[PDB]
Amino acid sequence: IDQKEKELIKESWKRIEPNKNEIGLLFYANLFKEEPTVSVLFQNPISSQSRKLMQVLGILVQGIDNLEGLIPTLQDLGRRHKQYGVVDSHYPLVGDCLLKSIQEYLGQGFTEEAKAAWTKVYGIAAQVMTA
Amino acid sequence: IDQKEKELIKESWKRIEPNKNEIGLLFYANLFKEEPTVSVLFQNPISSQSRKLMQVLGILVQGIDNLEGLIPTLQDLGRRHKQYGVVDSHYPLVGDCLLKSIQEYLGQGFTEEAKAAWTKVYGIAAQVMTA
Amino acid sequence: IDQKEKELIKESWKRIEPNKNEIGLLFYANLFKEEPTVSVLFQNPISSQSRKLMQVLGILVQGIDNLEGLIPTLQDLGRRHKQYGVVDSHYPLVGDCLLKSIQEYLGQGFTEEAKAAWTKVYGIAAQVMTA
Numbered sequence A, B, C: 001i002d003q004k005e006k007e008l009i010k011e012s013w014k015r016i017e018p019n020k021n022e023i024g025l026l027f028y029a030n031l032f033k034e035e036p037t038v039s040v041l042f043q044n045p046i047s048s049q050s051r052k053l054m055q056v057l058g059i060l061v062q063g064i065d066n067l068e069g070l071i072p073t074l075q076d077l078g079r080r081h082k083q084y085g086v087v088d089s090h091y092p093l094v095g096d097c098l099l100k101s102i103q104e105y106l107g108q109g110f111t112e113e114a115k116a117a118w119t120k121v122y123g124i125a126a127q128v129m130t131a
């Protein structure tokens, strides 16, 4: 993750943040339309789950200058996800759906370079979580 | 089985399947320690026998939306089992041992919800096989 | 152990190792079928037991150029074995079953010359453990 990529994360976060509730909820709609059996793993109200996911994305942004410091957090997270029945193959699905939902809700406000930076950051977080 | 159970079977199979050889082999070790008398019935290499049992569990997953479609297959397999010396009381022994072995090998990666759904699917298969 | 036998141990271990989880669990199933009386000695989860056995076999391979260096390790392990109820006459049975299980899982992958070598290496380890 280079300096330009860090600043693209911060800039695009300023576009995602004020629309975070909508982007999270669109993400679950899009995810359950693309993989029609994964919704059973979600046992809590989806509005609550969406707040949790968007809070962690905001933590990644907040730590973007030193993702290394987020390694323990992400490891603990990744462990809990195995306990929910989440498997390694779910991560590319979730990443693609999240990035497409951000791109969908913001349109041109989410730039191609910003989406490339988020692809990398998600790929990092997924690697750390899946050990 | 209901829609949530069908989904749990499909999603949990994504963790059981890549570990299916180990889970099968663990299941024969566990079954032979729990009920040493049953081991005489197994006359073929256990490495090949585990492959066959795991192949049928994959078929149950592939067919899980319409287990009725599998009734004739399961009836033929139940008839063959009677030829091997298998009797009705062996089915609950085998289901307990198989479920325990998937729970052992996967630990908390086999969720309580998935275990309940697989418990039900095993019961259905054992019922069809024994008429 | 001569130079050629040492090489055969090292050669066959590159085939055994990637398969070690399955070979160790197949060994328990086969042991418990061949010798139903001994399963009562194995009181911990067999998935964890198999990991422990295959780890020590790795250590025997790692130290194959100087098995005399492993004498203390093997003495300590043999003492533990007495505390688990294991007696000398168990050793040939376990060795036979272990070798037959590696042969079964690898087939053609396990040559006669490699099986002979492992026979000698098992015999050395069992002699040391039984002092």
Ligand code: HEM
Pocket: A038, A041, A042, A043, A044, A049, A052, A053, A056, A057, A077, A080, A081, A084, A086, A087, A090, A091, A094, A122, A125, A126
């Ligand atoms: C970087 C990727 C991800 C992040 C930041 C993330 C974030 C979160 C967070 C913050 C939680 C709340 C509970 C906890 O902290 O343990 C959660 C729960 C959960 N996540 Fe994720 N997640 C990610 C990937 C995934 C993937 C790939 C899936 C696959 C479907 C998934 C499915 C779930 C499920 C099923 C729950 C539990 C919902 C419940 O309470 O029933 N997550 N996730």
Ligand code: HEM
Pocket: B038, B041, B042, B043, B044, B049, B052, B053, B056, B057, B077, B080, B081, B084, B086, B087, B090, B091, B094, B122, B125, B126
């Ligand atoms: C849902 C439950 C079961 C499934 C899916 C299943 C599956 C299989 C399959 C696929 C075979 C290969 C031969 C064939 O297709 O006829 C087989 C053979 C066998 N099964 Fe099962 N089985 C089940 C329950 C049982 C039970 C309850 C026992 C009681 C010990 C058992 C004992 C055996 C034996 C002895 C053989 C033959 C081994 C040999 O060839 O010598 N199975 N089983």
Ligand code: HEM
Pocket: C038, C041, C042, C043, C044, C049, C052, C053, C056, C057, C077, C080, C081, C084, C086, C087, C090, C091, C092, C094, C095, C122, C125, C126
């Ligand atoms: C070269 C031969 C063997 C090796 C490398 C080996 C390795 C081990 C290892 C690493 C352990 C873990 C506990 C510890 O480290 O003290 C162990 C435990 C054990 N071994 Fe062996 N072993 C061998 C032979 C045997 C034989 C001949 C038996 C006879 C049945 C046997 C039965 C057991 C039992 C019952 C335990 C304890 C299981 C428990 O925790 O309940 N092992 N063996």
